[PDB]
């Protein structure tokens, strides 16, 4: 299937493409031709990946100099595996068409914990542990000692990789993570480091955001080599939250105590090093005078001089002083306090800690800790986190804020206070990506309206188009139910949350919808506490028992183990005729991680508009700062955060292969024009005024009829 696109001719593996695919390809080609960053939305969970990859490959063939390589990022490794599968299929199709191999390379990066071949680190699954063990095995000290070949466990894979892969790079091919593990085992090399080196000469590289956003690890692999590369973020509508998380650092009392203990161990190790080997490790002082990774981005990062901290004892005392200041500032009991610049000024005044020497604290920590030949960085990780916070605060506070919480939420009195350093704008941390890369395409599904995104992230978009899925059959028939059998408002307001009548309306709607809907249904609440209250009310009444009789019921919990077990049983229930009703939370990690396909989550129920609690002070900074700068109304941003989350958690049923399914929102709030307007275009256009505010019974009847229509073949 060769498509005569306006720009050029583009190959395509599958037989047919919908008109929305034509629109997507033409708009994407327009953006690439303009060579300017832009954002676009496409409904389908699958199909967008293949269309995007095919268009990018064709554009690379036409103008190889224009685009150096493609950097395609996905939320999670299980998801990016499907992307690499799609890319492998496309490459096989193109190779068959051409009749011969071409110099094209495509690979996926992942954590050493996810992929590795060392038996010692294999049993351990905790990421910091894998990082520390690998650092110990690959340490420059361990490398030098391996040169001596003394009796000590040395990781042969990295040494063999240094010997061979340095000389010879991999010719070409596509390697999934699992297949790359096998390749590393066969060749006695690192599946991780081999891909890391291939990044220098790779046409396509795929990895999650935390490999491309956080300055600590993103920069090293996203160096200026890709000066003009097509960087693409997929389903990255929750990009602001992750970009903020890449900067926010949380300091707790337990973490601070662990830091103090680690610092004591550091002092003891320094004394032992002084008595054992002093001159050779002191040479570090000379190289320092000449002049865990830094959190400072490219331009913000500075390397002039370490500062007043030039020796191990001096640096240790500096960390002692800063840790004492943080300890006392956290121990203070008072209302939540915000102080972005005042915190730095008060630190400098109270404990005599100048911001310039504080700036290089984390970098000097890395160097000095390397000198100590520590067993691993896992033990001292809390100290490195505190150092990253210490350097960040002295680095900048213009678009940041230090929040102190002597008392935690959900606890009238708790002896574990927490100090947050949550950011307020993601533009600060995502600026390097936009500036360095010629164009970035934020391709997303279920995207809340694009107009806000340029305001939140400071960039000038080239194209702003919303693509609506078009099929010969109406795959999706969304509806909103606001009126119950009692013709009573069913809004899940904070003041209306306690309403037993509203809870009863929700329970009856779920009962009837489970009675009619086929096997497999997922209901998303607004919070764990609200979900528990509704479940308890239904349990006190007889509605819950009737729901249990009609279909099996499963519930989500904060604990990941129970969540995984419940979802595993839910899948089997969906396969069998019992069916299942999975209650979950919109913010729950399960909602974002899981993907619902044919005969999975057939009818997506949304109980109440997803709104975060109006007491969490972090969102207060994040929101009022957005009001002050970029001029976004607080209510506007709050409703945007609700609609984007709802679209995220309700857009799964249309994953791909044209699998029918209905999305019912049991809240009259969605019927409001603002919510409908902010809803994604593809869902909204299907939505109509006739079914906008159906009663519970009317919604059930129309759902039954729509399921009848979708049951029959094409």
């Amino acid at each position: 299937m060769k498509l005569n696109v306006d720009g050029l001719l583009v190959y395509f593996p599958y037989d047919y493409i919908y008109p929305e695919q034509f629109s997507y390809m033409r708009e994407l080609k327009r953006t690439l031709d303009a060579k300017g960053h832009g954002v676009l939305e496409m409904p389908s969970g699958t199909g967008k990946t293949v269309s995007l990859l095919a268009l990018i490959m064709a554009y690379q063939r036409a103008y190889p100099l224009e685009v150096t390589k493609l950097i395609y990022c996905s939320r999670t490794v299980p998801e990016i595996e499907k992307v690499i599968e799609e890319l492998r299929k496309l490459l096989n199709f193109y190779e068959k068409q051409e009749g011969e191999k071409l110099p094209f390379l495509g690979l996926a990066l992942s954590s050493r914990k996810n992929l590795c071949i060392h038996p010692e680190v294999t049993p351990l699954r905790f990421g910091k542990d894998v990082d520390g063990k690998c650092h110990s095995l690959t340490a420059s000290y361990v490398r030098a000692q391996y040169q001596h070949d003394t009796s000590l466990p040395h990781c042969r894979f990295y040494e063999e990789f240094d010997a061979h892969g340095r000389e010879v790079p991999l010719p070409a091919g596509i390697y999934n993570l699992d297949d790359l593990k096998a390749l590393g085992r066969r060749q006695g090399w690192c599946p991780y480091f081999l891909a890391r080196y291939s990044i220098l000469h790779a046409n396509v590289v795929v990895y999650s955001y935390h490999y491309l956003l956080d300055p600590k690890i993103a920069d090293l692999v996203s160096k200026e080599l890709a000066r003009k590369a097509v960087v693409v973020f997929d389903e990255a509508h929750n990009i602001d939250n992750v970009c903020i998380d890449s900067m926010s650092v949380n300091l707790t009392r337990r973490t601070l105590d662990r830091c103090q203990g680690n610092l004591e161990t550091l002092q003891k190790t320094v004394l032992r090093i002084k008595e054992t080997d002093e001159q050779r490790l002191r040479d570090e002082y000379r190289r320092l005078v000449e002049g865990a990774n830094p959190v400072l981005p490219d331009e913000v990062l500075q390397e002039a001089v370490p500062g007043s901290i030039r020796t191990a004892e001096h640096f240790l005392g500096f960390l002692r002083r800063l840790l004492e200041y943080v300890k006392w500032r956290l121990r203070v009991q008072h209302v939540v306090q915000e102080s972005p610049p005042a915190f730095l000024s008060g630190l400098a005044q109270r404990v005599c800690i100048q911001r310039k020497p504080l700036r290089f604290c984390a970098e000097r920590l890395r160097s000095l800790l390397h000198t100590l030949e520590i067993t691993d960085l896992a033990d001292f990780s809390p100290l490195t986190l505190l150092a990253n916070f210490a350097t960040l605060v002295s680095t900048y506070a213009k678009g940041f804020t230090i929040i102190i919480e002597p008392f935690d939420d959900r606890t009238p009195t708790i002896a574990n206070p927490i100090l947050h350093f949550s950011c307020m704008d993601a533009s600060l941390a995502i600026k390097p990506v936009f500036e360095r890369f010629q164009s970035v395409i934020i391709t997303s599904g279920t995207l809340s309206p694009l107009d806000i995104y340029p305001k939140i992230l400071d960039f000038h978009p080239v194209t702003m188009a919303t693509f609506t899925m078009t099929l010969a059959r109406v795959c999706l028939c969304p509806m909103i139910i606001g009126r119950g059998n009692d013709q009573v408002a069913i809004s899940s307001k904070f003041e209306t949350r306690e309403d037993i009548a509203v809870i009863r309306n929700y329970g009856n709607l779920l009962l009837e919808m489970s009675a009619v809907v086929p096997d497999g249904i997922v209901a998303f609440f607004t919070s764990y506490q609200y979900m528990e209250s509704t479940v308890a009310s239904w349990y006190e009444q007889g509605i819950l028992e009737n729901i249990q009789r009609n279909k099996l019921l499963f519930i989500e919990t904060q604990d990941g183990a129970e969540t995984s077990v419940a979802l595993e049983k839910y899948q089997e229930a969906c396969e069998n005729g019992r069916g299942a009703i999975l209650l979950s939370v919109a913010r729950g990690k399960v909602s974002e991680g899981i993907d619902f396909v044919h005969h999975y989550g057939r009818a997506v129920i949304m109980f109440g508009v997803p709104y975060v609690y109006t007491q969490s002070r972090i969102l207060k900074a994040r929101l009022e700062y957005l009001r002050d700068q970029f001029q976004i109304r607080e209510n506007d941003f709050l409703t945007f955060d609700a609609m984007r989350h709802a679209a995220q958690c309700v857009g799964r049923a249309i994953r791909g292969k044209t699998d029918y399914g209905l999305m019912v929102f049991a809240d009259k709030r969605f019927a409001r024009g603002d919510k409908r307007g902010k809803l994604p275009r593809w869902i909204q256009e299907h939505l109509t005024d006739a079914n906008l505010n159906l009663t519970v019974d009317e919604g059930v009847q129309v759902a039954k009829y729509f399921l009848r229509q979708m049951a029959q073949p094409f």
Binding site: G307, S308, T311, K327, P357
Partner: protein, 171 residues
């Protein structure tokens, strides 16, 4: 307040944390209920060490770590010296070399004998006070004044923003 207790009367440190450390030439975790016990007999003598004190050598401080208490007080005293701004020296190394010597002096004073430090500090007193030390006292006073002025300007702007949006709504 996290300290287990005074070397002698570790009681108050358990009942209430209101007591704050008292700095002395000895460098000690002294506590007010124990300061009264020192005043009654000796009147300015460390109980165990017996170090003489002119006038009780007592000043309030707030950190559970006695080493941090001594280090912070010594740094407070030292900052009065070597306060010249960085830009005064064009040499790249000299920017932080003198700070290295300053912190070395602080660590020296914390534990080792301070006689050499005092003699050196006399030498720096004579040579630098002639011109530079008083000049940088003036400049640091100017920057303290202007930082307090700038914070009051920030808070005037925030009060005006609050009250003007309130008057927008009511109008």
């Amino acid at each position: 307040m996290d300290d287990q207790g005074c070397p002698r009367c570790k009681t108050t440190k358990y009942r209430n944390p209101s007591l704050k450390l008292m700095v002395n030439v000895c460098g000690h975790t002294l506590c007010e209920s124990c300061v009264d016990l020192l005043f009654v007999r000796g009147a300015g003598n460390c109980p165990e060490c017996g170090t003489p004190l002119r006038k009780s050598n007592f000043r309030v401080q707030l950190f559970e770590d006695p080493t941090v208490d001594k280090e912070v007080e010594i740094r407070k005293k030292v900052l009065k010296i070597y306060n010249k701004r960085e830009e005064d020296f064009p040499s790249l190394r000299e920017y932080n070399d003198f700070l290295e010597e300053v912190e070395e002096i602080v660590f020296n004073l914390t534990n080792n004998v301070d006689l050499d430090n005092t003699k050196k500090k006399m030498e720096i007193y004579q040579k630098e006070n002639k011109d530079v030390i008083q000049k940088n006292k003036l400049k640091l006073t100017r920057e303290q004044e202007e930082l307090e002025e700038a914070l009051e300007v920030e808070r005037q702007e925030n009060e005006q923003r609050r009250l003007f949006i309130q008057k927008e709504e009511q109008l």
